[PDB]
UniProtKB/Swiss-Prot annotation:
Substrate binds at residues 72, 76, 87, 121, 125, 135, 170. The keyword Oxidoreductase does not apply. Residues 1-188 form the GH11 domain. It is an enzyme of class 3 (hydrolase). The chain holds residues 35 to 223 of 223 of the full protein. The lineage of its organism: Eukaryota, Fungi, Dikarya, Ascomycota, Pezizomycotina. Keywords: Carbohydrate metabolism, Glycoprotein, Glycosidase, Hydrolase, Polysaccharide degradation, Pyrrolidone carboxylic acid, Secreted, Signal, Xylan degradation. GO terms for biological process: xylan catabolic process. Optimum pH is 4.5-5.5. Stable from pH 3.0 to 8.5 at room temperature and from pH 4.0 to 7.5 at 40 degrees Celsius. Pathway: Glycan degradation; xylan degradation. GO terms for cellular component: extracellular region. It comes from Hypocrea jecorina (strain ATCC 56765 / BCRC 32924 / NRRL 11460 / Rut C-30). This is Endo-1,4-beta-xylanase 2. The active site is at residues 85, 176.
Length: 189
């Protein structure tokens, strides 16, 4: 299991972050594979992909995702200028991250309808330090743990709705958790 941080493994960018609570391990495997095992964790995010991402990447993911509590499985990344944290959520545990959020439309992509939302983080950690910034969400109605994500369909639908992205920073397939348990094994390409 590896030290929290970022870097490259077998061709792929990876990012592994946690809040120090303990209770989560992240491992990098061959090619685009990574595993996450957690038991009464704190907040964490880990996965593999690209640095920088692009606005027309077709991202393939495959494997197993077994959350017990609050967790997401998503295409996850950031833009700069404007600073945005974004999610194309393919599956989740006990909490739909769009709960209570204002719905800003729908997009159909890769075998499912997704609902689109914007939320705001106020004075929270980001890739550039503490900041207030928007998050964009596409939440898949039909949950899965393998598939293909045509990111352009999401980014274009977001732009159509007034949710603009800046320059891309990293772009990964990530398992996120918040004080939960579970296991995941995911291969990205």
């Amino acid at each position: 299991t590896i030290q929290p941080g970022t870097g490259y493994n077998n061709g792929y960018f990876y990012s592994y972050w946690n809040d120090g609570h303990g209770g989560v391990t992240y491992t990098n495997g061959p090619g685009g594979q990574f595993s996450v095992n957690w038991s009464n964790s704190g907040n964490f995010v880990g996965g593999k992909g690209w640095q920088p991402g692009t606005k027309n990447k077709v991202i393939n993911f495959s494997g197993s995702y077994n959350p017990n509590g609050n967790s997401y499985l998503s295409v996850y990344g950031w833009s700069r200028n404007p600073l945005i944290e974004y999610y194309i959520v393919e599956n989740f545990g006990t909490y739909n991250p769009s709960t209570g959020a204002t719905k800003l439309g729908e997009v159909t992509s890769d075998g499912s309808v997704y609902d689109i939302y914007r939320t705001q983080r106020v004075n929270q950690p980001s890739i550039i330090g503490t900041a207030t910034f928007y998050q964009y969400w596409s939440v898949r109605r039909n949950h899965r743990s393998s598939g293909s994500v045509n990111t352009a369909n999401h980014f274009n639908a977001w732009a159509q709705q007034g949710l603009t992205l800046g320059t891309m920073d990293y772009q990964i397939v990530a398992v996120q958790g918040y004080f939960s348990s579970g296991s995941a094994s995911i291969t990205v390409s």
